[PDB]
Amino acid sequence: GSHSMRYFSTSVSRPGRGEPRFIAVGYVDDTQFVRFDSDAASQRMEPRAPWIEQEGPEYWDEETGKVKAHSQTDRENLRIALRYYNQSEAGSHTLQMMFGCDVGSDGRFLRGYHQYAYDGKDYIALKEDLRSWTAADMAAQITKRKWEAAHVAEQQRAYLEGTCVDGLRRYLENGKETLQRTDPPKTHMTHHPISDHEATLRCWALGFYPAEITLTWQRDGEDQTQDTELVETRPAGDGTFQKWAAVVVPSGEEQRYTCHVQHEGLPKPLTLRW
Amino acid sequence: NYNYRYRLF
Amino acid sequence: IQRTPKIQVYSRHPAENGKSNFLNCYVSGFHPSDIEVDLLKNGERIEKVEHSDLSFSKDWSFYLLYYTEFTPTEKDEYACRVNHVTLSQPKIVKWDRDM
């Protein structure tokens, strides 16, 4: 099915403690493949997955050029924001950006993104048509107006339907053995008495890729949305992921509860009972 | 492949 | 404006005593990005501890993984100690072999 490429970047101002640090990473799907750290002492875009090292030195020469560039740009943008918002020059502020594209089963273009966030909150972002902009407050409209007289959407739209799609498609062949796998979750159940009246039932899903997964409990076929304890999908390290779901149940009733798993690498959804 | 163009606010 | 981190301590594989593992502290959903994560074995800071590169989620919140090879033994207790501005004292989370 589909695939996605994402670059995420964080600039952070540290006044007095020196200069805005700038960190950027790239993903295909849920696998990190490149990075850039403004405080690295290397000042080169670095590899992070094995299948990106096959790219030659002109690649690393290029990408380092684009992402050192953008780093200085946002470093100034941090100043423009502290202007538009009337903030003091002793506080730390964060500038975050993501952009990328999603493609179908054929490698055709599907949807593109180009968004910014100041200090944890939506600032400006490109619409779905990739023609118009969505500013989030007054300061971002000053910037929204600037970026329509400049036809910046035109520019970013050109990158997304072309360069973004082209390069992902390339990486999807370079790493087809890592990136086109789907690993189904191995699943088990655990069980523990809290009191002499109750017990916990924990439904575990280990070692799957990609990250999407659903884990839901039921009692006599009834969704137990509010008594369920459900953790964030977490990374194992090797590039698989983990997730579990937990219910407290009364001692002697563990047979009415069931736990359902859905994943890509599962033909049929699974069901697990204690 | 990183982006090509970058704008100021 | 600012969100506290969610902390998970766990092993890559379920904990076989005497079989090497990887101990993980995952931290997610926090803001600002500035954070400190430390791993503790029976209280003491573990020295050589790698971490992933600053990344964030669909909703602008940050996540990070901190990890370290290790071999779980019967008498050893591990934990994760997280230092963030949302917390007034660093929050400490004990490794539970069934969590």
What string of H, E and C letters represents the secondary structure of C6-28? EEEEEECCCCCCCCCEEEEEEEE
CB-CB under 8 Å, A73 with B8: yes
The CATH 3.30.500.10 domain(s) of chain A lie at 1-181
Whether the Cβ atoms of residue A63 and residue B1 lie closer than 8 Å to each other? yes
Q: Shortest Cα distance from B8 to chain A (angstroms)?
A: 6
**Cα of C95 vs its chain's centroid, Å:** 9
Domain A1-181 has CATH 1.10.3720.10: no
CB-CB under 8 Å, C65 with A10: no
Residue C48: which domain range? 1-99
For residues A209 and A238, what is the distance between their CA atoms, to the nearest angstrom?
A: 11
CB-CB under 8 Å, A84 with B3: no
Which residues, 6 or more positions from A126, have their beta carbon under 8 angstroms from its beta carbon? A112, A113, A114, A115, A133, A134, A153, A156
The CATH 2.60.40.10 domain(s) of chain A lie at 182-274
Secondary structure class of A257 (helix, strand, coil): strand
Q: Do chains C and B touch (3 or more CB pairs under 8 A)?
A: no
Q: Where are the alpha helices (DSSP H) in chain C?
A: none
Question: Resolution in A, one decimal?
Answer: 2.7
Give CATH for domain A182-274.
2.60.40.10
CB-CB under 8 Å, A238 with C10: no
For residues C87 and A125, what is the distance between their CA atoms, to the nearest angstrom?
A: 31
Comparing alpha-carbon positions, the chain C residue that sits nearest to A245 is C99
How was this one solved? X-ray
DSSP A129: S
DSSP A237: S
Count: domains in chain C: 1
Residue A173 has a CB neighbour count (10 Å cut-off) of 11
Q: Please list every residue in chain A whose beta carbon sits closer than 8 Å to the beta carbon of residue C32.
A: 12, 92, 94, 119-120
Please identify which residue in the block is written with the tokens 């952070």. A12
Residue A169 has a CB neighbour count (10 Å cut-off) of 16
Check which CATH number belongs to the domain holding C99 and give it.
2.60.40.10
Whether the Cβ atoms of residue C34 and residue A12 lie closer than 8 Å to each other? yes
